[PDB]
Design a protein around this ligand. Structure first.
Ligand SMILES: Oc1cc(O)c(-c2nnc3ccc(Br)cn23)cc1Cl
Length: 207
């Protein structure tokens, strides 16, 4: 298991997300679903010039899986997945500018719900999660597990769990007072409100 420090600006953003009083927490789901849709768009486009990229799975979709026993909500997609370089360096590097812009906008009247306009919506996960675990598999790379409970660091390890094929699974370990996001009717409500026109099947599992 390797431990890494977040870029300072991203640590700052995460602390803001964790510490700011902001009741409209449900927007985390729209942001994660949007990121999944983006990843699905990417593999779809790439498969047009190289159809073998779908040898790891032709189905392009999103599953939402709540688990009350584990207190987790998992957002699964069969998108392009992430390389080790994506996890450690790339996604944090590209998020730098967006983080700065977002934090500046907040000082000038914007609110946290606008976070996706700056390309850093993933971090809204920390509105509801005490810990986020991300399992990911990109073609031509190994399956990885990324994990962070904030506090300025994240880990990455090669994942010896059940093979995914291709895509990304974001596992939200929900805060004690955020268990509403495990309820069928609540998730349905949020998807209908914010994610109605996503261009991929979204299947909400029940318990
Ligand atoms: O399918 C996906 C779904 C996602 O939420 C993400 C994603 N977007 N931003 C980040 C930041 C860190 C990690 Br670890 C995953 N991210 C990336 C892919 Cl590839």
């Amino acid at each position: 298991v390797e431990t890494f420090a977040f870029q300072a600006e991203i640590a700052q953003l995460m602390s803001l997300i964790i510490n700011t009083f902001y009741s409209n927490k449900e927007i985390f789901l729209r942001e994660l679903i949007s990121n999944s849709s983006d990843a699905l768009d990417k593999i779809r486009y790439e498969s047009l010039t190289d159809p073998s990229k779908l040898d790891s799975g032709k189905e392009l979709h999103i599953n939402l899986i709540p688990n009350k026993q584990d207190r987790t909500l998992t957002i699964v997609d069969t998108g392009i997945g992430m390389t080790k370089a994506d996890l450690i360096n790339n996604l944090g590097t590209i998020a730098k500018s967006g983080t700065k812009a977002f934090m500046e906008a907040l000082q000038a009247g914007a609110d946290i719900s606008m976070i996706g306009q700056f390309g850093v919506g993933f971090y809204s996960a920390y509105l509801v999660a005490e810990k986020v675990t991300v399992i990911t598999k990109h073609n031509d790379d190994e399956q990885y597990a990324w994990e962070s409970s904030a506090g300025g660091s994240f880990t990455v390890r090669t994942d010896t769990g059940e093979p995914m094929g291709r895509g990304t699974k974001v596992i939200l370990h929900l805060k004690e007072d955020q268990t509403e996001y495990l309820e069928e009717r609540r998730i349905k409500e949020i998807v209908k409100k914010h994610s109605q026109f996503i261009g991929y099947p979204i299947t909400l599992f029940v318990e």
